[PDB]
Design a binder for this molecule. Structure first.
Ligand SMILES: Nc1nc2c(ncn2[C@@H]2O[C@H](COP(=O)(O)OP(=O)(O)O)[C@@H](O)[C@H]2O)c(=O)[nH]1
Ligand SMILES: [Mg+2]
Length: 178
């Protein structure tokens, strides 16, 4: 089974790390590739063999017109936001969900909270407070998920890989089907 999955969301939520941490089981953080690319993984899910094509995106505003060229024939989207970036969570509803739905009205969405590992980091919570902000909590992401009617809400870390595999199994599970 060939499944095409597109990953959207604000620059720097960790889309490229998520894809590479997934396909290769190692985290770039140190050396992140800047050429926007597509990747591949052969996965077994509920006894069915799957070839999953993962398509990265340029979330920059400069790419508003060209980004949707990679949307045709997509089987499932991950809309991603950083659990340590409220601005990114805001943009799911202000920008990403509306753009996905504009081009692909019926394609399933998985809502993904990323950098799960920084949610307890001290220096991180601290910096967030200096802006009168705080990490997105599980209940908050679940609510956004319900707002936008995504098939699942899932948290992960590319750095630790916690929950990373489930993100992709549910992606696959959402195509073929509820
Ligand atoms: N601590 C932590 N940092 C991450 C994680 N995923 C990505 N990052 C960092 O976040 C920054 C942006 O990640 P990248 O994948 O380039 O984001 P993108 O622009 O959405 O594709 C980089 O500095 C990464 O090292 C994560 O799971 N944990
Ligand atoms: Mg990237």
């Amino acid at each position: 089974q060939a499944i095409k999955c597109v990953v959207v969301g604000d620059v720097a939520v960790g889309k490229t790390c998520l894809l590479i941490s997934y396909t290769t089981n190692a985290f770039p953080g140190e050396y992140i590739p800047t050429v926007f690319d597509n990747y591949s993984a052969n996965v077994m899910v509920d006894s069915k063999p799957v070839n999953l094509g993962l398509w990265d995106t340029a979330g920059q505003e400069d790419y508003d017109r060209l980004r949707p060229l990679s949307y045709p024939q997509t089987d499932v989207f991950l809309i991603c936001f950083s659990l340590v970036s409220p601005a990114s969570y805001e943009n799911v509803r202000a920008k990403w969900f509306p753009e996905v739905r504009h081009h692909c009205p019926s394609t399933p969405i998985i809502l993904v909270g990323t950098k799960l590992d920084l949610r307890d980091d001290k220096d991180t919570i601290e910096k967030l407070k200096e802006k009168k902000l705080a990490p997105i909590t599980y209940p908050q992401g679940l609510a956004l998920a319900k707002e936008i009617d995504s098939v699942k809400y899932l948290e992960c870390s590319a750095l630790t890989q916690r929950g990373l595999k489930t993100v992709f199994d549910e992606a696959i599970r959402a195509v073929l089907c509820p």
